[model samples]
Target: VKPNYALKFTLAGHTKAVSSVKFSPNGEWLASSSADKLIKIWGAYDGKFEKTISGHKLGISDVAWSSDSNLLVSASDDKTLKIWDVSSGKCLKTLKGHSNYVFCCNFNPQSNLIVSGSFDESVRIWDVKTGKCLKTLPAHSDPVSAVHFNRDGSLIVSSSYDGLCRIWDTASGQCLKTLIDDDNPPVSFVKFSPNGKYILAATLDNTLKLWDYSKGKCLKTYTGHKNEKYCIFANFSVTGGKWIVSGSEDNLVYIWNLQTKEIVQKLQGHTDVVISTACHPTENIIASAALENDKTIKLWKSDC
Candidate 1:
């Protein structure tokens, strides 16, 4: 079914490329990270700019919110991660250890742990309260592009420019499964399905594959998005996970039917590469962001 999505508002404030965007788990706010060395928070429904957070010495690459939406974690090119209190917009802690730029990060479902992927080709698990680096997994041979925890936070998955994706046991820190395509395409983004039974991986080959991680099987492949130069993000629809959503380097947003594997919609507005996207936690709202040329965040709402 068509989502009846329409552009609601265009938010302009970031001075550089908006690297990542995420909705608070409570569906109250939208957080955007940018290469401008800043993070901006906006009212989820009104698109009103609420606050600006600053601390990172370099470009911010990714941001994730804690389950309660009271805190946010950010990864940056400064080779560090910062945990911020959502209300005060203050950095509570800075996590350091990675020898290179931190590219991606996520707070576990429990909100006590954080997993980060870095250009050093390592995935590190950090203690949220103590700000300690707990475990470092020598995950891949190339830059790790994305990393995430499963629904229950029992497992962690990572993707890399080495053309591979691996699932690891959270407690044991052991690599349990390695997934690779026959053509060896570089994977830019990856996330577990809501049920934690499958994985969605975005590759530079301009496709997103749904993988049955247990058996190392590719169940479905989604296309029609241009994502060759940058590590673009793709995800399940906010409402029901019945659809797939993604940003295109061709300056548009793409949606596909999850079950039928068919193109559903192509949203056009951005004048530059749309590299990041976020879906509201409990609403049918989608946020898309572009690179340096455009440097804007567009909010799309569905009538449902």
Candidate 2:
């Protein structure tokens, strides 16, 4: 079978490199963060820029929507993360604890808790309503690059510059498991599989691996994308695990067949490193963002 995804829109407005883009859980909004120090919310289906939220004192690294799609949390180089009320476009809380740049942030399935990773080499858990930092784990030996919660929110997975991916028990703030490649390449991004049994990790070694976290086994590897230097985001497509999609340092986006491990397609258009890619929760669509040289977000739709 052939992949028939096509570019539908190119969004512009950010003054610097686009760092991250994510689709809301409800699939109605797309949030993009940037070195421009802003988080822009767009209509997910139309790619229309609906709102631009500017409050971060420095470049923003990541933004994630709550499970209910009513709130957003942003991680910034300003050394803090802000929870915003989506509808009101107001900052509901500024969660601060990290001693350095906050690189990534994500909400659990319940939306009552948030998990953040930082350059300070820590992972923090926060209470959403009270804006209280509940716990901090000195998670890595190096900078923490990315953090995410499992499907049920019972576990949190984080990756770091230390060449390791560690899984934590959310309720108890305990490290349950640590997975690493034999070469010990610095890990740039990590996510739990849809089924919560595996992890997908992107290493600076120019490869992505699917691991059985419970056993610390690498089940499969996806290749053919350039990711040797900077942090490049990768993800499982929202097709019940049929496909894997990732941004490349080579200025393109790649889609691979998850089971066959074949390059299904390469999306071309961006002029710089495609730093981030995100899949729609319930559709055959993708959102990709490039670095400062491109400074644009493009939406791709599958014509299946």
Candidate 3:
């Protein structure tokens, strides 16, 4: 199931490590946040540099884009989240509430609110206007690794190192369901499928598990890619759940068919650990970014 592709170009601008890479909501720009404390935006098609934003005092941990693609939100090691205006490259708001390192953040599908996960063992929902905490959930006993809102923005899915993936009701902040296995290991990352019925999670157990969030069952488990240490993030691309894409510590980008769980492709080019990966919002292109010495984000594509 290998697809034809050419190594388009290496996006080179980060002074340190590039951690997260993603395309904007409209697929016109690609954004990469780095350990150098800068977020760079590039033209999604040509890899052209759009601009550089430098305000986070520490390295950025994760990034999320608005539904309209007009705003950018980032979580940082500085224990803060910042919102930026895309057109003017201005810092609209610097959210300061997390007492520990912020690991991940999420945006509502149709609202101006944000949800963030932190090492303080909580998830805080924020108001985009005044940068105030609206609702807080001390949801876990350990660090919350990844958090995301369902497409409808009614439910939230969060993964913690405490070996549980919990679903919470957004309005009441009550735990709805806990998706766990009697023999499960520490969960690294978790994300919902396009239809909001499934969660794709990467774990230190050296595999990715697809869970049925509603039924509290593990539907499918994908192997072959290694995540010996880091809790990697795996996702379904724009093709609606047709494929799963993720980076590996082995320095390769792995793509699996969603239905059969077969390896369709393994892209090799990065010289170090492949930490993060992303697919374009509206196109077939895939991009993978590195961890350490490898300092470029490689873009791949297939045409028949």
Candidate 4:
């Protein structure tokens, strides 16, 4: 049978390259960042512009919503991460520590802790409530590209341009495991599975590698993208962990079946590089940002 799919809507407002997009946990709001230096919030289902959260001096790299859905954290090329109250659309706290651009960030599931990866070659953990940095993990030899917390929130994983992926213990800020020599190109993204049993890592070489977190072994490798790609991002589908959705610089978003270890379907329409993406928490929906001539964001839905 042919796979089911549909275009939810095209969000058009950014004047420059769109960098990242994420859905609120409740799936009611969508947040997007752009090189135009703006953060926009929109009604997830209807594409209505809710508010624009802005203050960054440089391009916004990524934005993440808190577990409670009340707060949002954004990283910028301005070398700072800012936390905002989604309801009021106000910047609540500005976290400053990175020497270069803050590339990515993720909030812990159970605590007020936030982990941010930066171009300064460091990953920092911060207390969101107190706005104080708790620990500075200076392990990456080059710029960090992505950071994420596992489902249990006990472990944090990060990828760097240094061609390595490191798992760190959240409570102690200790490096638990390091996966290296897996890619000739730098690792761009790494995320934990919902069960915290596996990890999905993407590289600039245009490939995806699956690893068994418990065993610290690379279990599978997927290579189907047409050319060299960069800045890949992925998250699990709401239906189950059976499917994974990923966006790539190859200008496509793909849905892969983890059990089959193959590309199940590909969503194509972007004229530029699809840099980042996030899945809806409760629906079969995905949103992505593109860095092309259009500089727009697109949303997609599975016909399932």
RMSD of each: 0.9, 1.0, 1.4, 1.7
In order of lDDT, best first, we have 1, 2, 3, 4
Worst 10 residues of 3 by lDDT: 232-241
lDDT of 2 by residue, 1-304 (tens): 6577899999999999999999999999899999999999998989998999889999999999999999999999999999999888899999989999999999999989999999999999999999999999989999998999999999999999999999999999999998867879999999998889889999998999999999989989999999998888889985544889999989989999888899999999999999999999898889999999999999999854
Candidate 1 residue pairs in clash (backbone atoms < 3 Å): none
The TM-score that candidate 1 achieves is 0.99
lDDT of 4 by residue, 236-280 (tens): 775534676777666887777766768888888888877877877
Q: Name the regions of candidate 4 deviating beyond 4 angstroms.
A: 182-184, 226-229
| Cα lDDT computed for each candidate against the true fold | 0.93, 0.93, 0.85, 0.83
lDDT of 2 at 282: 91
How many residue pairs clash in all the candidates, one count each?
A: 0, 0, 0, 0
Compute the lDDT of residue 215 as modeled in candidate 3.
83
TM-score of each model, in listed order: 0.99, 0.98, 0.96, 0.95
TM-score of structure candidate 3: 0.96
- Model 3 C-alpha lDDT versus the unseen true structure: 0.85
Total colliding residue pairs, candidate 2: 0
Instruction: List the lowest-lDDT window of 10 residues for candidate 2.
Output: 233-242
